[PDB]
């Protein structure tokens, strides 16, 4: 059985290229030796157990039409290092054990799949994961401990969702994280301890959200921070600004503008142009 129907196969490494055939299902008779499987740009609707072989290292399923990944689909892909399920606009939800088995996975792409929520334990056990792309879904909340096992995660992209709050332990377990992108949500509130333990984080984007203030304790929990983007938020330059203002007095970081939206008498000024005297009556 040497190459799946309408695909092209290569031997070093063992690769099966099945891109752009308008397939409705994953082709049959995948050689067990296959390490790279390229199924992007098809119209595949469902995935089931018994479809993928155990030697896969790379599996690209982006730009398909997936709506259901049945239980057990990925369970025996112990070796898998990269899984891209991005751009499946009707996917919508994932069952809680979808990634069980994938303890060697290093990159997981879930961008643009209409996810509105995730199971709280969906990323459990993904101890190898270094890159997780969840941008441009419709996510409304993230639970505490949603990433708690992801000790090696370096990039977490959550921009372009519908998040309103970051809770106390939403980022617990992310001790290796280097970049956290949360721009283009609707964030209104960040818990004072939401960034606790993010000791290696160097880049934080929070621009284009609905933040009127941010707690001073939270920036202080980012000792490694190098670049912060805070622009396109309705910053309140009243007594609420004092902790962020104070942090910026000491901070050595690159930053965007932090433009006051309110009160009218400070609208348009940068929050760093305020002086100690402006906060004396707080
Ligand atoms: C892409 O997947 C979507 C969602 O499963 C399909 O839209 C469903 O299509 C059937 C028509 O056969 C309807 O019963 C459902 O109302 C549709 N659901 C939604 C949410 O639109 C669509 O047919 C699929 N297209 C291809 C080419 O695979
Ligand atoms: C601010 O962020 C939002 C994402 O919430 C951006 O908005 C919308 O953004 C685009 C249209 O301008 C489209 O790509 C989307 O279909 C639409 N999405 C949502 C969820 O509303 C908006 O562009 C961002 N603004 C800037 C200047 O970056
Ligand atoms: C798949 O490929 C064609 C031709 O390039 C594309 O335009 C078409 O819409 C796709 N097929 C189906 C069945 O929709």
Curated annotation (Swiss-Prot):
Subunit-level organization: Interaction with MAG is controversial, and may be indirect. Interacts with MAG. Does not interact with OMG and RTN4.
Function comment: Cell surface receptor that plays a functionally redundant role in the inhibition of neurite outgrowth mediated by MAG. Plays a functionally redundant role in postnatal brain development. Contributes to normal axon migration across the brain midline and normal formation of the corpus callosum. Does not seem to play a significant role in regulating axon regeneration in the adult central nervous system. Protects motoneurons against apoptosis; protection against apoptosis is probably mediated by MAG.
One of the GO BP terms on file: corpus callosum development
LRRCT domain location: 233-282
Keywords in alphabetical order: Cell membrane, Cell projection, Disulfide bond, Glycoprotein, GPI-anchor, Leucine-rich repeat, Lipoprotein, Membrane, Receptor, Repeat, Signal
Protein's UniProt name: Reticulon-4 receptor-like 2
Gene Ontology cellular component annotations, sorted alphabetically: axon; cell surface; dendrite; external side of plasma membrane; extracellular matrix; extracellular space; membrane raft; neuron projection
UniProt note on tissues of expression: Detected in adult brain, in neocortex, hippocampus, striatum and dorsal root ganglion neurons, and in retina (at protein level). In brain, detected in cerebral cortex and hippocampus. Weak or no expression detected in the cerebellum, thalamus or striatum.
GO molecular function, one term: signaling receptor activity
Domain LRRNT as annotated: residue spans: 3-32
Keyword Cell membrane: yes
Gene encoding the protein: Rtn4rl2
Biased composition (Basic and acidic residues): 266-278
Sugar-modified residues: 22, 65, 208
Location in the cell: Cell membrane; Cell projection, Dendrite; Perikaryon; Cell projection, Axon
Post-translational modification note: Undergoes zinc metalloproteinase-mediated ectodomain shedding in neuroblastoma cells; is released both as a full-length ectodomain and an N-terminal fragment containing the leucine-rich repeat (LRR) region of the protein.
Native source species: Rattus norvegicus (Rat)
Record carries keyword Cell division: no
Start-end of each LRR repeat: 33-54, 55-76, 79-101, 104-125, 128-149, 152-173, 176-197, 200-221
Family affiliation: Belongs to the Nogo receptor family.
Membrane topology: Lipid-anchor; GPI-anchor
Principal subcellular localization: membrane
